[PDB]
Amino acid sequence: SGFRKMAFPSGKVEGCMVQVTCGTTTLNGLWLDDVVYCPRHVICTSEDMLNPNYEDLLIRKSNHNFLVQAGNVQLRVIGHSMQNCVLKLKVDTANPKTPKYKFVRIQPGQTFSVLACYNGSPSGVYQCAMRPNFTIKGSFLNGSCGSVGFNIDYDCVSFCYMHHMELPTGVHAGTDLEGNFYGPFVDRQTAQAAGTDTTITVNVLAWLYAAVINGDRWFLNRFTTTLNDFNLVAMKYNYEPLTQDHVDILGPLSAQTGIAVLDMCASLKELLQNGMNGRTILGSALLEDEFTPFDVVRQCSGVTFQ
Amino acid sequence: SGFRKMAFPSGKVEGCMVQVTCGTTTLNGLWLDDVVYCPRHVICTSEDMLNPNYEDLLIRKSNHNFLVQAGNVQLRVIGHSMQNCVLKLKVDTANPKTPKYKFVRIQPGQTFSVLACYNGSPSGVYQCAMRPNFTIKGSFLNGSCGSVGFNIDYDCVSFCYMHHMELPTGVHAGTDLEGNFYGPFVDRQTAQAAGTDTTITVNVLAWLYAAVINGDRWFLNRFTTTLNDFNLVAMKYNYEPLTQDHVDILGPLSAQTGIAVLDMCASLKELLQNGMNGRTILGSALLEDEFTPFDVVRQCSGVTFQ
Ligand SMILES: *[C@@H]1CC(=O)N(CC)C1=O
Numbered sequence: 001s002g003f004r005k006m007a008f009p010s011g012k013v014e015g016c017m018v019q020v021t022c023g024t025t026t027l028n029g030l031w032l033d034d035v036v037y038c039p040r041h042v043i044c045t046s047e048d049m050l051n052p053n054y055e056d057l058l059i060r061k062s063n064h065n066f067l068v069q070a071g072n073v074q075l076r077v078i079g080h081s082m083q084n085c086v087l088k089l090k091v092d093t094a095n096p097k098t099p100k101y102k103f104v105r106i107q108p109g110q111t112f113s114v115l116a117c118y119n120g121s122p123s124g125v126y127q128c129a130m131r132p133n134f135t136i137k138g139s140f141l142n143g144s145c146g147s148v149g150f151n152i153d154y155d156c157v158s159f160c161y162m163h164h165m166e167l168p169t170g171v172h173a174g175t176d177l178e179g180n181f182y183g184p185f186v187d188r189q190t191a192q193a194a195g196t197d198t199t200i201t202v203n204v205l206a207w208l209y210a211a212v213i214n215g216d217r218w219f220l221n222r223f224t225t226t227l228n229d230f231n232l233v234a235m236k237y238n239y240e241p242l243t244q245d246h247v248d249i250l251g252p253l254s255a256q257t258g259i260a261v262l263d264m265c266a267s268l269k270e271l272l273q274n275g276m277n278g279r280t281i282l283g284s285a286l287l288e289d290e291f292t293p294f295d296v297v298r299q300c301s302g303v304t305f306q
Numbered sequence: 307s308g309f310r311k312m313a314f315p316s317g318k319v320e321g322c323m324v325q326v327t328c329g330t331t332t333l334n335g336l337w338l339d340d341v342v343y344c345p346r347h348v349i350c351t352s353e354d355m356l357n358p359n360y361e362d363l364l365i366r367k368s369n370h371n372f373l374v375q376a377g378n379v380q381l382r383v384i385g386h387s388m389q390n391c392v393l394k395l396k397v398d399t400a401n402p403k404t405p406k407y408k409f410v411r412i413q414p415g416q417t418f419s420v421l422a423c424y425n426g427s428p429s430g431v432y433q434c435a436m437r438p439n440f441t442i443k444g445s446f447l448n449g450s451c452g453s454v455g456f457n458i459d460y461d462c463v464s465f466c467y468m469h470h471m472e473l474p475t476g477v478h479a480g481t482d483l484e485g486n487f488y489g490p491f492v493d494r495q496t497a498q499a500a501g502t503d504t505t506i507t508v509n510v511l512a513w514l515y516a517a518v519i520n521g522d523r524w525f526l527n528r529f530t531t532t533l534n535d536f537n538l539v540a541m542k543y544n545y546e547p548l549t550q551d552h553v554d555i556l557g558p559l560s561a562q563t564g565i566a567v568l569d570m571c572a573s574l575k576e577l578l579q580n581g582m583n584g585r586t587i588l589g590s591a592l593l594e595d596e597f598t599p600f601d602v603v604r605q606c607s608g609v610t611f612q
Pocket residue numbers: 100101102153155156157
């Protein structure tokens with residue numbers, strides 16, 4: 001028993017981080033097979049970032065202007081190309097530590113682990129969710145750009161995020177591994193608006209099921225509700241609307257606990273209108289929305305990986 | 307910016323987990339050099355655990371009764387011995403992946419990362435603190451015994467915890483790597499009392515400094531206090547008393563932020579007496595006590611590891 005915000009084991013990703021330098025800018029790259037992936041703003045100076053013309057900046061760079069370092073191992077760049085907002089550096093050495101892997105573009109509300117790196121070296125690992133406004137609430141200092149987010153499926157690493165930017169509000173934005181930003185953001189140092197950060201309802205419900213499984217039952221009430229009535233209350237509290245797909249994904253948790261999804265929704269509704277009244281749930285005094293239904297099942301069943 | 311409950315990267319430990327079987331009991335072992343470490347209750351059946359006589363049970367075991375598996379790699383046991391509550395199995399193969407390492411016995415309030423494993427395979431990693439009553443609030447299912455807790459110092463892994471038991475209250479107990487339990491607990495399935503779980507005050511203060519560094523300043527008040535006056539209030543709320551050693555360890559955070567430790571103590575005192583009033587700090591509605599002062603510095607400065 002017990003319930004923790006658990007990250008994936010990071011060993012398979014640790015072996016893929018390198019340091020990429022171009023001019024005086026140093027960040028992190030991801031070395032898979034014979035390609036290194038990194039943010040294209042490695043070719044920018046601090047002044048360039050206010051209004052960069054990436055095509056024009058990239059024209060004055062040759063293969064030998066990119067220094068890629070894996071420990072004290074020097075990789076030779078034999079080709080480079082820009083794909084959307086990432087640079088692909090072809091090197092002469094395939095990474096012997098290349099895990100089995102796949103690039104995935106995730107949806108808001110999904111969760112992943114971030115391996116925070118500086119100078120190609122791992123600093124720590126934590127779990128987070130892609131917010132509905134396409135930001136993440138990370139922990140990133142200068143130099144962390146190119147750190148990656150990932151999930152593990154048995155022996156397979158799914159890379160879903162590469163860190164690019166901190167917004168002036170203190171939240172973080174980045175791309176998938178094809179270089180397409182999540183959200184409306186661009187790799188320019190300019191004021192950029194994020195939208196409303198709503199709460200991920202299907203994740204809150206999953207975490208309430210985790211609570212019941214672990215013995216926290218006080219919030220279970222006498223009421224039920226309908227999906228329209230719940231969604232009417234949810235939207236007033238800046239909660240994401242629940243759909244039938246969400247009800248379907250929660251089915252295994254409803255079966256294991258004997259609590260109908262709509263019954264759990266009526267419990268959540270009372271919590272939104274009456275608050276927690278100084279109570280806690282799974283050691284939190286706020287409703288937690290960074291566990292997906294699959295996260296809960298994984299942690300409550302003991303799934304392992306390569 | 308941003309602040310996250312960050313675990314250490316787990317790659318160096320992943321390479322040291324094996325599966326240990328004896329009879330019908332399977333758990334995890336830690337393979338370092340040519341020794342495997344595991345909980346001695348691997349030699350117990352489920353009935354033995356009610357009242358085990360370990361010396362007597364161990365007499366009916368020979369080297370070949372212990373099966374140790376690292377992937378599909380079979381290790382040969384050439385010697386075994388009991389040291390306190392851990393078994394030391396000497397195998398014929400040194401682990402080629404042995405990191406540089408050291409066994410440490412930690413103090414309550416210190417933090418470490420746990421690599422939760424099942425059948426010798428990593429499941430996830432999370433950060434936690436040794437509670438003042440010598441339990442940890444972990445996430446562990448059956449089969450997780452022998453999972454280890456650790457810290458990293460550059461290239462050096464410090465192993466500090468091995469999981470042994472879940473108490474009937476749902477909290478977790480274990481040993482250092484010399485087999486000595488943390489706390490008054492024994493490896494017997496019997497009702498065992500844990501004492502009061504107090505809040506780790508010096509960690510709460512460190513996290514308040516992290517908040518100020520990251521822009522959460524609302525709780526900073528007009529008052530100051532003394533260490534005796536604060537400790538008088540702290541003890542009423544089941545907070546650990548603060549000592550001068552604690553003030554000393556917080557010195558670098560006081561210097562960076564310009565806020566005297568005793569001033570921060572008076573802010574904490576008002577929070578204890580008046581509550582948060584629906585406010586949050588670093589996204590939490592409770593005072594968080596699982597960051598040490600060193601954790602805060604590490605995360606706010608970007609320390610990295612091998
Ligand atoms: C992991 C290895 C890989 O490429 N795949 C393809 C679908 C995986 O699931």
